[PDB]
Design a protein around this ligand. Structure first.
Ligand SMILES: NC(=O)c1ccc[n+]([C@@H]2O[C@H](COP(=O)([O-])OP(=O)(O)OC[C@H]3O[C@@H](n4cnc5c(N)ncnc54)[C@H](OP(=O)(O)O)[C@@H]3O)[C@@H](O)[C@H]2O)c1
Ligand SMILES: Nc1nc(=O)c2nc(CNc3ccc(C(=O)N[C@@H](CCC(=O)O)C(=O)O)cc3)cnc2[nH]1
Ligand SMILES: [Mn+2]
Ligand SMILES: [Mn+2]
Ligand SMILES: [Mn+2]
Length: 159
């Protein structure tokens, strides 16, 4: 099973200048809980944005060019990325925009955080078709001293 996990600001913005400009510790904690002990697939730009391997997960990087770090696994196509995960129950796709586009048609589950924040950005989560997806979990949180925007955790499953 393939799942996508992402945090979206208003208008599906996910990034600007190869960064995420907000800081929401509660969402990063949600990301860690839902990805720990699973393989994670990311594109090369997202790898550069994170800047280090994510511990406790098999890190798989998509790039058309040879890898430059043997602490992670480098693959050259979507099918190779999936194969490199082995026989696991759930593969997590962690972006970015180009990678999400390619994996969306193959995904059964979306873990989305909706952040109430207006961000100028240059990268968006794919338009998906709402009729294809059932909301099975949602949890709203107001802003607090640690998290400066309100946010909604949602899990959707392909109908
Ligand atoms: N808010 C969120 O949830 C979230 C999550 C992830 C990322 N982001 C943001 O998203 C932005 C990065 O997204 P992006 O769309 O620019 O880039 P990306 O999807 O992270 O990376 C694209 C790169 O991945 C490689 N690639 C993708 N598909 C491939 C394929 N089928 N075969 C081989 N290589 C493939 C290529 O690398 P080569 O050029 O080396 O071939 C391509 O240039 C940043 O702003 C980041 O902060 C946000
Ligand atoms: N909901 C969501 N939020 C994100 O921030 C996110 N980020 C990415 C890609 N970028 C990043 C950037 C940093 C870390 C990171 O530092 N993660 C630590 C945080 C642990 C914690 O804060 O408790 C990790 O070990 O996962 C992960 C992904 C992909 N999907 C996402 N999905
Ligand atoms: Mn092929
Ligand atoms: Mn197999
Ligand atoms: Mn806000």
């Amino acid at each position: 099973m393939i799942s996508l996990i992402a945090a979206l600001a208003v208008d599906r913005v996910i990034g600007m200048e190869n960064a995420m400009p907000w800081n929401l510790p509660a969402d990063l904690a949600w990301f860690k809980r839902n990805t720990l002990n699973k393989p994670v697939i990311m594109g090369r730009h997202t790898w550069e944005s994170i800047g280090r391997p994510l511990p406790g997960r098999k890190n798989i990087i998509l790039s058309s060019q040879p890898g430059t770090d043997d602490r992670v696994t480098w693959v050259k196509s979507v099918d190779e990325a999936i194969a490199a995960c082995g026989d696991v129950p759930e593969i997590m796709v962690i972006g970015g925009g180009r990678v999400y586009e390619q994996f969306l048609p193959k995904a059964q589950k979306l873990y989305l955080t909706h952040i109430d924040a207006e961000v100028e950005g240059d990268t968006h989560f794919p338009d998906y078709e709402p009729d294809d997806w059932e909301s099975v979990f949602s949890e709203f949180h107001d802003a607090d001293a640690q998290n400066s925007h309100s946010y909604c955790f949602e899990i959707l499953e392909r109908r």
